[PDB]
Design a protein around this ligand. Structure first.
Ligand SMILES: Fc1ccc(Cn2cnc3ccccc32)cc1
Ligand SMILES: Fc1ccc(Cn2cnc3ccccc32)cc1
Lengths: 360, 360
């Protein structure tokens, strides 16, 4: 049975389970169940399922080299599909809440969930809470007697925490750290001293890489009972590296991918985000270029934004991007090789993860 | 050592632990650690600690009838303090996010967290997320090798889910259920057909009673290794009953307790909440009174609000309140008696919980 079809079948199964449990154990009525069904569909479906399919793909690789009864294969694949849905649902939680936080307008060519007429922020904040709570319900129900349950829950907790920390690093990245203060309204950085490669690396490591790459690879390992086929420090290193590369790409596209293809209007420049482009631009700018950057960055006025995009184009950031890409390719292929020492299988799953990321 | 002092000592301990772990394992800087320290203090401290102290009080009761080494007593008390902080922190999460959702202005005589100048909704939504994530960090660190860890985590998950469900019941309570629809902006009920005792009971059961009464009593039991001293159906029943009574009180005070004493300006009437007062009023109203209620409820205009408070005063809701109170006293004392069959100790802890609630 093909992995994607399996994964989608399991969505239906889990959806039905969560809603039936709301009726039998939490006194829900049919109309609020319907509202939550539509919310689940609208917030969890319509992407490529990269995260959750990685869990499946990792598990499928181990199945090919590991003796099991057919029923065990099925159990493992099912677990991998559940686990992948846990991660899809965690992402849905973060997309819902971050859209609200960031005043976002669209997502994937449709309005952000909080912007639907019958939702509003009042409901959407809670809908996002429920999204995450469903991840735990999934685990407790489907993995109740599994030997990996402890480890999976503990990992998932850490990933989720690291992610929330990353949001804090991301939305405060345009403020001077020494002036953070709940009591005082926060000014934008005027010096941009904290727009550095190391700082940017921290933002991106936490904001995305733990849930997007680390958690899908290690959850694959856990449902497979295959933690011993890897040196977990290598897995972490490669996860964080590939994920950085994924985010740099995302940053580039925010500025340069036409809205129709992007699925939304990018506003990094207006929001003064510590983006790859801004950090790299500042890494190579002369005095005049820095000064012009500072006079135009983080302003909604479209003329100011155009001045910033000109600076980017004129600074030939493409070249710095190719150089970065080249190093990352180098360092990923290296990490894969170190991973082949304990598991050619797991190494190959990483290689696929890298290909899907490096091309899109 | 006195229980409250112990409980407060443990706050300091846990605070230091969570922040030190952010520095050693999550790459936090000193200024963002400071921001999270102030957030934790401002969102978790300044209430009466009823929830978390109930865990302690339950545990202290078992210690008085149960042989242990002194070091075991201390371990149990510490666990109870941690567990009580888990519940305080869960409440802090819900207060932060519900203030944002509900457009609230003040809480405990101070501005809601999202309204602090250097916070804003962008940060506050995430701060609330972190608040809950800290509950799990507490558990995983302090209860790592505890025999109750599984059960505590599983219970805590259910409580938290039930609570999020309760928020959904509470904020949609003034909409006709058949017209819930993410696609369509939601009108206020014109008939108020769903302002019934059974519906109201559902809202309040989920919105408050699971985290405020159920979770503190059962967490006391769990840290005590004393689940067998109770018939958990009795515990649930008494929890849900006392908690309902707590919420009815809260509803009354929203309308009639002067803002300075309340700690905030009550706006249930303006927000069209399915409150005890509204349900009871409608339970006894004649045709003219219903019609006047419907012409004035759920409107911000202060004259309309005054018309609603007059209707309440003129309908002598005090009398219905005493009758309700009388029944609840009756049914609580009954449940306590059933609890004495397996544990006079646990029964007495319930009796204290009831006294603190019934008097404030
Ligand atoms: F998913 C994650 C994977 C690793 C880390 C970092 N880390 C390393 N050791 C740890 C012990 C306790 C807590 C965090 C820890 C964070 C999140
Ligand atoms: F804290 C709680 C305590 C009891 C219930 C209701 N309930 C009863 N049995 C259950 C099995 C699975 C899930 C929920 C369940 C909800 C929350």
């Amino acid at each position: 049975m093909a992995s994607m079809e399996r994964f989608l079948s399991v969505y239906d199964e889990v959806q039905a389970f969560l809603l039936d449990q709301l009726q039998s154990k939490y006194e829900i009525d049919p109309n609020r169940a319907r509202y939550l069904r539509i919310m689940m569909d609208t917030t969890c479906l319509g992407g490529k399922y990269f995260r959750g399919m990685t869990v499946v793909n990792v598990a499928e690789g181990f199945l090919a080299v590991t003796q099991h009864d057919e029923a065990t294969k099925e159990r493992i694949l099912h677990d991998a599909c559940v686990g992948g849905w846990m991660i899809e649902f965690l992402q849905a939680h973060y997309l819902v809440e971050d859209d609200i936080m960031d005043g976002s307008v669209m997502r994937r060519g449709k309005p952000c969930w909080y912007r639907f007429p019958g939702v509003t922020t009042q409901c959407a904040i809670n809908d996002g809470i429920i999204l995450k709570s469903w991840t735990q319900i999934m685990a407790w129900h489907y993995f109740a007697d599994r030997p990996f349950l402890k480890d999976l829950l503990c990992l998932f907790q850490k990933v989720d925490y690291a992610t929330a920390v990353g949001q804090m690093y991301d939305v405060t990245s345009m403020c001077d750290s020494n002036k953070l203060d709940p009591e005082v309204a926060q000014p934008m950085t005027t010096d941009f001293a904290e727009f550095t490669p190391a700082i940017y690396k921290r933002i991106v490591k936490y904001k995305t890489t733990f849930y997007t790459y680390l958690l899908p690879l290690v959850m694959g390992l856990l449902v497979s009972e295959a933690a011993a086929s890897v040196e977990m420090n290598l897995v972490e290193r490669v996860a964080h590296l590939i994920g950085e590369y994924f985010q740099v790409q995302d940053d580039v596209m925010d500025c340069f991918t036409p809205p129709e293809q992007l699925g939304k209007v990018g506003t990094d420049i207006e929001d003064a985000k510590c983006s790859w482009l801004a950090v790299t631009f500042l890494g190579k700018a002369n005095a005049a270029q820095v000064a012009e950057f500072k006079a135009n960055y983080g302003e909604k006025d479209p003329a100011k934004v155009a001045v910033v995009k000109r600076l980017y184009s004129k600074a030939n950031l493409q070249a710095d991007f190719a150089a970065y890409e080249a190093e990352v390719v180098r360092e990923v292929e290296s990490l894969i090789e170190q991973l082949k020492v304990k598991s050619p299988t797991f190494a190959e799953s990483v290689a696929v993860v890298w290909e899907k990321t490096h091309k899109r």
